[PDB]
Amino acid sequence: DVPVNLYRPNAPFIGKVISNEPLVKEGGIGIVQHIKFDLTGGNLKYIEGQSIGIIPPGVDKNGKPEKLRLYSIASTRHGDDVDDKTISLCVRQLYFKHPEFPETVYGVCSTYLTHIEPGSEVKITGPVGKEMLLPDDPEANVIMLATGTGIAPMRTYLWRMFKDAERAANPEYQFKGFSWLVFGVPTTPNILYKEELEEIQQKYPDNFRLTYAISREQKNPQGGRMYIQDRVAEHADELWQLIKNQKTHTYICGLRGMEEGIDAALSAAAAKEGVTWSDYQKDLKKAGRWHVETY
Numbered sequence: 001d002v003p004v005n006l007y008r009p010n011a012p013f014i015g016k017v018i019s020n021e022p023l024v025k026e027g028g029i030g031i032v033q034h035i036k037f038d039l040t041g042g043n044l045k046y047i048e049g050q051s052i053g054i055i056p057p058g059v060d061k062n063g064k065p066e067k068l069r070l071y072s073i074a075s076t077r078h079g080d081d082v083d084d085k086t087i088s089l090c091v092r093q094l095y096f097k098h099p100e101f102p103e104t105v106y107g108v109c110s111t112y113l114t115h116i117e118p119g120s121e122v123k124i125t126g127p128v129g130k131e132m133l134l135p136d137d138p139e140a141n142v143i144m145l146a147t148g149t150g151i152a153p154m155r156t157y158l159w160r161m162f163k164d165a166e167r168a169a170n171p172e173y174q175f176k177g178f179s180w181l182v183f184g185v186p187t188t189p190n191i192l193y194k195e196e197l198e199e200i201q202q203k204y205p206d207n208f209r210l211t212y213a214i215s216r217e218q219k220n221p222q223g224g225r226m227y228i229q230d231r232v233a234e235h236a237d238e239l240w241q242l243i244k245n246q247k248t249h250t251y252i253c254g255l256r257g258m259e260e261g262i263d264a265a266l267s268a269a270a271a272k273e274g275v276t277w278s279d280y281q282k283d284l285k286k287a288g289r290w291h292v293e294t295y
C-alpha cells in the first residue's frame with residue numbers, strides 16, 4: 001500500500017530540477033534551499049513523511065563513487081503544485097571545521113543540491129520509510145517537534161491538512177483535529193516557510209498552533225538561548241495531556257540531540273500522574289504513535 005523502493009541505487013530515477021529557491025532570508029545563518037524536481041517520465045510516487053535518496057556526482061577521497069544521501073520529502077504526495085508531477089526537498093548546506101589546511105569542508109551532496117541549477121538532471125531513489133507516516137484519521141491530534149530541516153515532513157503533513165488545493169484534492173481527508181508545531185531555528189530569517197506557516201495559523205486558529213524557539217532572539221527562564229527542549233519544558237503538562245489521547249501522534253525530526261531534553265520534560269509531567277514516561281513512550285512507539293527521524 002505504502003510505496004517503497006520504486007527506484008533503487010543501481011537504477012535510479014533521473015529527475016529534472018524545476019526550481020531551487022532560498023528559504024533562509026537575509027540575516028539568517030547558513031543556506032537552506034527548497035528544491036523541486038520533475039517526476040514526469042517515471043513512476044515515482046510517495047506519501048507524506050517519506051524520504052528519497054539523492055546520488056551526487058563524483059568520487060570520494062578514495063576514488064569510489066559517492067553513495068546516496070537521504071532527504072525528507074518536503075512536498076505532499078501531489079507535489080507543491082498539487083498536480084502529481086513533482087517532488088520537493090528542503091536541503092541545508094553542510095559546512096564545518098577549524099583552521100587546518102584545507103580549512104573549508106563542504107558536504108558533498110548538500111552542496112551539490114543547494115547549488116543545483118534548474119534543468120539539471122538528478123539521480124533519485126526511493127521513496128523510503130514507514131516510521132513517519134501521518135494517520136488517515138482526520139480527527140487525530142498531531143504534535144510536530146522540529147528543528148531546522150526537520151520541518152520537511154511537517155510541511156508535508158501541514159500542507160495536506162491545511163492548503164486549499166490539498167483540501168480540494170483530498171476529499172477523504174478533511175482535517176478537523178488539532179496540530180501543534182514547535183519549531184526551533186536560530187533566527188527569524190531562519191524560520192523556514194515562515195509566511196506559509198503563519199498563514200495557516202491565521203486561517204485555522206482552532207486546528208493549528210505554531211510555537212517558535214528562536215535561539216539568537218529568545219532566552220529560556222534560566223537565561224540560556226531558547227531551544228525546542230525549552231519550549232517543550234514550558235508546555236510539558238499541556239503536551240502530556242494531549243499525548244494521553246488515544247488518537248494523538250507525535251513527530252520529531254531534525255539533527256540528532258533534541259530527544260533527551262524532550263524526554264526529560266515529558267517524564268516530569270507524566271511522573272505527576274504516576275506514569276513512567278520511558279515505558280509509556282515504548283508502548284506509544286510500538287503502537288505507531290511516536291515517530292522519530294533524527295540524523
Ligand SMILES: Cc1cc2nc3c(=O)[nH]c(=O)nc-3n(C[C@H](O)[C@H](O)[C@H](O)COP(=O)(O)OP(=O)(O)OC[C@H]3O[C@@H](n4cnc5c(N)ncnc54)[C@H](O)[C@@H]3O)c2cc1C
Pocket residue numbers: 051069070071072073090091092093094096097106107108109110111149150152293294295
Ligand atoms: C532519514 C534522513 C533524512 C534526512 N533529511 C534531511 C533533510 O530533509 N534536509 C537536509 O538538509 N538533510 C537531511 N538529512 C541529512 C542528509 O542525508 C546528509 O547527511 C546531509 O545533507 C550531509 O551530507 P553531504 O554529502 O552534504 O555531507 P557529506 O560529505 O557526507 O559529509 C558528511 C560527513 O561530515 C562529517 N563531519 C565531521 N564533522 C562534522 C560536523 N561537525 N558536523 C557535521 N558533519 C561532520 C561526518 O563524518 C559526516 O559523515 C537526512 C538524513 C537522513 C538519514
